[PDB]
Design a protein around this nucleic acid. Structure first.
Lengths: 27, 99, 49, 99, 1053, 50, 6, 22
RNA sequence: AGCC
């Protein structure tokens, strides 16, 4: 369903788990 | 190559990391397998035929991986390494061993 | 320091495979500082010596 | 890594406070230096490898010549000696000076 | 008194007829304000008692069983006539609850509760409306097929289970256990899915629900933690560590929530779904509620071949790398030399006689095979191993040198041990000569493990914040913890050949380090048990045939399997962390192994990112798989799963799965002893977050402690029989408080239980007079000392009398005579007169000199265990958690350092206490009977160091009487600076024995007052000098009341 | 050797160890017996010869 | 009767 | 008959030798 | 009447 797949699009979007995006601004 | 079971039992009974006065970590002998002898041999030629710069990753606590870094700087030309990593490799040598 | 006959034997071989493979090089071997580097662990240099 | 010539960055403006919040603003300075006291308490390192308590009171009870079984009631010398309060005092002396 | 009010209200419910009368029996301390002993009950109309009241609760539709949800054909809930066609093939061992309480007793304990709370107020009404909607499902399913009437020993025959489904009894038992634990609306939505789905899905329900708990402890942030020092002492550190999780964990946690929707669970995967939006510690007890409730589904009892088929069928290949197995065998070899270097060079006395060291301690071995023995004229069948020696030492067959082979000719029998929600584990049943060879050498391996940082015997105390508190002392933002779950540890390829040849190679470097002829022999016999287990066959019965399967691996049930499995982990996780260091550069902070569950904390140079967590986990389950050990590699930054403990976000969470109304093995207890196991499994589940009702438990103690002598008469004991501090204790008045009563009629009854505390058994007195018991005692006195003395030989012959109390029929002739002699005292209210000092006699003299006042204490410490009840969390936040553990083993004394070195015996602390207060020539007569030589026992007595050893035994004996190191008193700090402001006792010197007990009893009365009421008091005891000297002469003649079923009440697992 | 019950009894009077207080003279008698003398006399001579 | 499974 | 029962306490052997203080 |  669209409700369960939208969890996996929110769970990576939020900022309390995201770290070190800046080796990929250079790549 | 020599046997890994032989070079470990010689090296871990001369250094004797289990009987020092620092008991804040479990000291044992790491990274002396036989897949790293081929991986360090291939990286050191292939980044020399293509002129690719190399960085050095190490830990200052392990002096066996720092004493054997003296052989790296006397064979591979120091024009190859990135300068902020060449400096930090030969500053930890003098500050902990030579001086 | 005790590995001397087997440490001269590296650099006679480490600088011969580099020397005989460089003959099969057609482009100029220019040397500038690249952006991304290739990581050498010094724990694996101990495993070679 | 060594960054290219087209790499840019934004510099913060670190100039000191122009409001003088420590001058006559005493209810706004008390809640702005409690904030720097809790943050400095989560940074100062905690003590590992302390001497054990039972191997220290038994050494301390031979010099004072206490009685048996009543080392806590005969003298009030040995009260509140824990390892929880050793780490608590080292944190609250470093973090009280930094804030 | 509240239990006496439910006892009188219960008998007015189960006996609705007019012919039932109740006669209360009273007694008094004086000859001529009285407490009652028991309640008689004459009832005659007793047929169809439960089947008539069940019909008023049987509404709605019954549960129709689904018959296509299990893979096997005998795990479905089919009719027993459709499964077992004839009465000759009917196996009870697949649904047996194995508890001495039938289903017709468990239905009355609920229908009695539903009548007391039928018209309550609007807060307790919603609990009643939630426990009635669940009981409609249970009653309407049982009432369709009727209630099965049990046997005389509480089993279920074929003729009463013929037209019913096969698991109707063992499902209605566990579902009553679950509906009597519903308190909130969140607990009602979990209980409805675990009652409906558990009627058909008897295989994979406890696995799907308890699956995502190893993942969800890695998402919760840390804000303030408890840490531990290098020596195990507690510290509080308030760092902030952020939880880092890769994108493949959420693609695996989504797979675990879609497997729970194929099975039909649609409201348990909505709580995990709505918790993942926050990932907060303040809603995490909801996530440990679901993990604790999943273990109450029931046990998975199967056939022995059908549960040992995936374990004994593995794929061994030669496509491993042999360069990795040379370092693995060498690292096992280096440990066995490192453990037995000091007891072999300096030739210890424990290794010099390994034959005698295993003989005097064979009561610690597991039960062997069932073998026919002959003791005089009697013929008994026993599985204890020390009974096999007494029959083999008589017939000329006791050869401890010759170790029997376990190849295809004589295979190894197999026993099982299972846990719900996990797979089963097999247990070897070895001969009695694999215990003698492997005891004096393994005991020298477990003294090195108690002083080494990387083993599990170091962090083994009574507390739980000091043991598992070293997990979070190396945690920061540049480190990660690496806990891996090896699936089949017992039969992996790294355990068959290189593990047995790494121990054999380590015992050949110890045959060149010594010079005695005995220490070479005991190191050769321990080597001989490894060559024979190199090629071992196992024996599994199924149907008519008996299968012999080759099994060269390591199973449990051996003697070395707790200390040699810990060596094979520290040599295997040291080889994997050396192959992963070719891609990264770290520094291993700690490694800690406990059997086959471990962790390792790696500290990195740069900060830990989301890419260094996904690529280390792909280099652990690919380096292990090069050695043919498939694993589930898990890496985390905040929390782990150490062995059955879940450290999530700074707090520590336990599991609360202990089955109350079911058991996994048919125990050898009575009903009176299983009414204290049922209560002590309720206190354990209450401290861990699974709160069952107390009034359902107190109803179950009513139906189990009562005992009838005639079919019309019943005797129900009262509260003062069950609660008093004696042999017959079952439960306590308040839950977590052990109270010592001080009343003139309460010490009168505790002395009345001192006559029949020791009974005689007719079986053990006929064995002890036989010829083969005297032949076993005579050949132990030959090896224990070269001389012959009459004092030591009666001291030996009356020591193996107590060893026969481990035998199950002998330990039942005592306990059946305890209860049958109590019935002549509960009917005749007059008792006997005697004087013997107990712990209550000492507290009679201290209590009238304490004066109490009101006091307050502000909260200063925080809570590290958030599932504890509310009245215990007020104590911890006010006086503090425990910092350092005080030992009560007594081995710091100078007499317990002499007994352990020069002899192999281990005397109880109740035995060392009685003998330390006698004269000089009475310690001599006792120490020779232990095996100590005359020249050594003349040294310790003639040195007068026993006078300074009197206070090291009394310190560790009073801590055993008041149960301070065990129970629920093992959380509060007793040396806290916030309990000394309440205890104000002036000091009077020169009598240390009385001053010690004034401060240990005042520390307990303040704690026991603040659990009952929730308010603190302050004490003051101006004790006179003329009452200290009178109490001084009673501190050494104090006697304890020891019971066999109470020694299991001190530990939790 | 000197008989251990006749030597440690003479030794325990010269120390005058009191049965009540924690003092540093109760530790003067830990670990003296006949076996510890025969293993210290060996490990002194045998270490010097090797 | 016995069945060997090696 | 255990050995802990047969050996007499300190208070029992203090009664076979009688004397009055004053 | 006995590890069912």
């Amino acid at each position: 369903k669209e409700e369960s797949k939208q969890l996996l699009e929110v769970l990576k979007t939020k900022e309390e788990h995201q770290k070190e995006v800046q080796y990929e601004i250079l790549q | 190559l020599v046997s890994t079971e032989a070079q470990i039992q010689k090296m871990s009974q001369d250094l004797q990391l289990e009987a020092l006065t620092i008991q804040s970590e479990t000291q044992f002998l790491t990274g002396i397998n036989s897949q790293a002898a081929n991986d360090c041999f291939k990286t050191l030629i292939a980044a020399m035929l293509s002129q690719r710069t190399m960085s050095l990753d190490f830990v200052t606590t392990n002096y066996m991986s720092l004493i054997s870094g003296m052989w790296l700087l006397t064979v591979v030309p120091n024009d190859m390494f990135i300068r902020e990593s060449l400096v930090a490799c030969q500053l930890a040598i003098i500050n902990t061993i030579i001086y | 320091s005790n590995r001397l006959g087997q440490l001269v034997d590296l650099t006679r071989l480490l600088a011969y495979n580099y020397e005989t493979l460089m003959a099969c090089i057609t482009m100029n071997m220019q040397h500038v500082q690249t952006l991304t580097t290739e990581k050498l662990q010094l724990t694996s240099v101990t495993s070679l010596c | 890594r060594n960054l290219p010539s087209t790499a840019r960055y934004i510099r913060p403006n670190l100039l000191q406070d122009r409001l003088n919040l420590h001058d006559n603003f005493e209810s706004l300075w008390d809640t702005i230096t409690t904030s720097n006291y809790i943050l400095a308490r989560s940074v100062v390192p905690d003590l590992k490898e302390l001497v054990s308590t039972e191997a220290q009171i038994q050494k301390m009870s031979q010099d004072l010549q206490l009685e048996a079984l009543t080392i806590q009631s005969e003298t009030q010398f040995l009260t509140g000696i824990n390892s929880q309060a050793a780490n608590d005092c080292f944190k609250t002396l470093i973090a009280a000076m930094l804030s | 008194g509240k239990y006496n009010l439910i006892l009188s209200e219960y008998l007015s419910f189960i006996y609705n007829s007019q012919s039932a009368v109740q006669i209360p029996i009273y007694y008094s301390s004086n000859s001529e304000n009285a407490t009652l002993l028991s309640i008689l009950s004459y009832s005659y109309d007793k047929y169809n008692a439960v089947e008539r009241k069940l019909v008023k609760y049987a509404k709605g539709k019954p549960l129709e069983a689904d018959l296509t949800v299990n893979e096997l054909d005998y795990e479905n809930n089919k009719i027993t006539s459709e499964l077992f066609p004839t009465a000759e093939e009917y196996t009870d061992l697949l649904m047996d609850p194995a508890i001495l309480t039938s289903l017709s007793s468990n239905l009355n304990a609920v229908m009695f509760w539903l009548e007391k709370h039928e018209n309550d107020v609007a807060e307790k009404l919603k609990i009643y409306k939630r426990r009635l909607d669940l009981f409609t499902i249970v009653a309407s399913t049982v009432n369709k097929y009727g209630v099965p009437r049990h046997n005389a020993k509480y089993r279920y025959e074929y003729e009463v289970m013929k037209d019913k489904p096969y698991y109707l009894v063992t499902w209605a038992n566990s579902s009553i256990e679950m509906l009597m634990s519903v308190f909130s609306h969140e607990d009602y939505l979990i209980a409805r899915e675990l009652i409906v789905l558990s009627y058909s899905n008897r295989s994979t329900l406890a696995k799907l629900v308890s699956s995502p708990m190893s993942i969800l402890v890695a998402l919760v942030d840390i804000n303030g933690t408890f840490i531990t020092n290098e020596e195990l002492e507690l510290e509080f550190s308030n760092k902030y560590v952020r939880a880092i999780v890769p994108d493949q964990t959420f693609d695996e946690l989504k797979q675990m929530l879609d497997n729970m929707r194929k099975a039909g669970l649609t409201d348990i995967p909505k709580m995990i779904q709505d918790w993942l939006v926050d990932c907060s510690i303040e809603k995490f007890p909801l996530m440990a509620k679901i993990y604790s409730w999943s273990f109450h589904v029931g046990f998975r009892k199967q056939k022995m071949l059908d549960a040992a088929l995936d374990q004994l069928k593995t794929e061994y290949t030669e496509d491993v790398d042999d360069e990795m197995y040379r370092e693995y065998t060498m690292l096992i070899r280096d440990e066995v030399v490192k453990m037995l270097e000091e007891p072999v060079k300096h030739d210890d006395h424990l290794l010099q006689d390994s034959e005698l060291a295993g003989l005097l301690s064979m009561s610690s071995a597991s039960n062997g095979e069932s073998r026919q023995l002959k003791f005089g004229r009697k013929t008994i069948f026993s599985t204890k191993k020390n009974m096999h020696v007494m029959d083999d030492m008589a017939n000329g067959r006791y050869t401890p040198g010759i170790i029997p082979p376990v190849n295809v000719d004589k295979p190894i029998p197999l026993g099982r041990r299972d846990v719900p929600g996990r797979r089963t584990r097999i247990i070897f049943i070895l001969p009695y000569e694999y215990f003698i060879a492997q005891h004096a050498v393994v005991e020298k391996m477990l003294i090195y493990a108690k002083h080494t940082r990387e083993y599990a015997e170091f962090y083994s105390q009574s507390n739980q914040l000091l043991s598992y508190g070293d997990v979070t002392r190396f945690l920061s933002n540049n480190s990660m913890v690496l806990y891996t779950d090896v699936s089949q540890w017992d039969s992996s390829q790294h355990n068959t050949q290189p593990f047995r040849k790494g121990i054999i190679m380590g015992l050949d470097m110890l045959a060149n380090m010594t010079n005695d002829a005995r220490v070479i022999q005991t190191l050769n016999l321990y080597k001989q048990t490894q060559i024979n287990l190199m090629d071992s066959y196992v024996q599994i019965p199924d149907g008519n045939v008996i299968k012999k399967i080759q099994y060269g691996a390591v199973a449990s049930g051996e003697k070395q399997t707790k200390a040699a499995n810990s060596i094979a982990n520290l040599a295997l996780i040291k080889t994997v962390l050396s192959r992963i260091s070719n891609k990264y550069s770290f520094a291993t902070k700690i490694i800690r192994v406990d059997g086959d569950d471990n962790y390792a904390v790696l500290q990195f140079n740069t900060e830990v990112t989301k890419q260094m967590v996904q690529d280390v986990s792909n280099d652990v389950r690919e380096t292990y798989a090069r050695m043919n050990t498939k694993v589930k590699a898990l890496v985390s930054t905040v929390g782990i799963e150490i062995a059955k403990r879940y450290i999530a976000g700074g707090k520590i969470f336990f599991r609360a799965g202990i089955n109350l109304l079911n058991n996994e093995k048919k125990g050898q207890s009575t009903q009176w002893d299983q009414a204290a196991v049922l209560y002590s499994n309720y206190i354990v589940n209450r401290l861990r977050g699974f709160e069952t009702d107390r009034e359902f438990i107190l109803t179950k103690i009513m139906q189990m402690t009562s005992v009838a002598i005639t079919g019309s008469l019943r005797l129900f004991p009262s509260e003062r029989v069950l609660t008093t501090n004696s042999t017959f204790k079952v439960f306590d008045s308040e839950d977590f408080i052990i109270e010592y009563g001080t009343t003139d009629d309460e010490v009168y009854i505790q002395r009345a239980f001192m006559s029949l505390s020791s009974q005689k058994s007719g079986i053990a007195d006929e064995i002890a007079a036989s010829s083969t018991f005297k032949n076993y005692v005579s050949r132990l006195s030959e090896q224990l000392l070269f001389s012959k003395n009459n004092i030591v030989s009666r001291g030996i012959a009356l020591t193996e009398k107590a060893k026969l109390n481990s035998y199950a029929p002998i330990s039942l002739e005592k306990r059946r005579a305890q209860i049958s002699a109590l019935l002549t005292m509960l009917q005749k209210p007059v008792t006997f007169k005697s004087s013997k000092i107990t712990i209550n006699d000492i507290l009679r003299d201290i209590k009238p000199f304490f004066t109490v006042n009101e006091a307050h204490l502000p909260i200063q410490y925080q809570k590290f265990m958030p599932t504890l009840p509310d009245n215990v969390q007020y104590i911890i936040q006010c006086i503090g958690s425990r910092t350092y553990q005080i030992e009560d083993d007594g081995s710091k004394s100078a007499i317990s350092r002499l007994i352990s070195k020069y002899s192999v015996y281990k005397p109880s602390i109740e035995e060392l206490y009685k003998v330390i207060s006698l004269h000089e020539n009475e310690i001599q007569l006792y120490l020779i009977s232990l095996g100590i030589p005359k020249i050594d026992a003349d040294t310790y007595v003639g040195s007068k160091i026993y006078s300074q050893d009197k206070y090291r035994i009394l310190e560790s004996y009073v801590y055993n009487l008041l149960s301070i190191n065990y129970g629920c008193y093992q959380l509060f700090d007793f040396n806290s600076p916030d309990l000394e402001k309440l205890i104000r006792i002036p000091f009077k010197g020169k009598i240390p024995a009385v001053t010690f007990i004034l401060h240990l009893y005042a520390k307990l009365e303040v704690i026991n007052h603040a659990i009952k009421n929730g308010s603190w008091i302050s004490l003051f005891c101006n004790y006179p000098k003329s009452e200290m000297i009178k109490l001084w002469k009673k501190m050494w003649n104090i006697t304890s009341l020891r019971s066999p079923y109470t020694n299991a009440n001190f530990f939790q697992d």
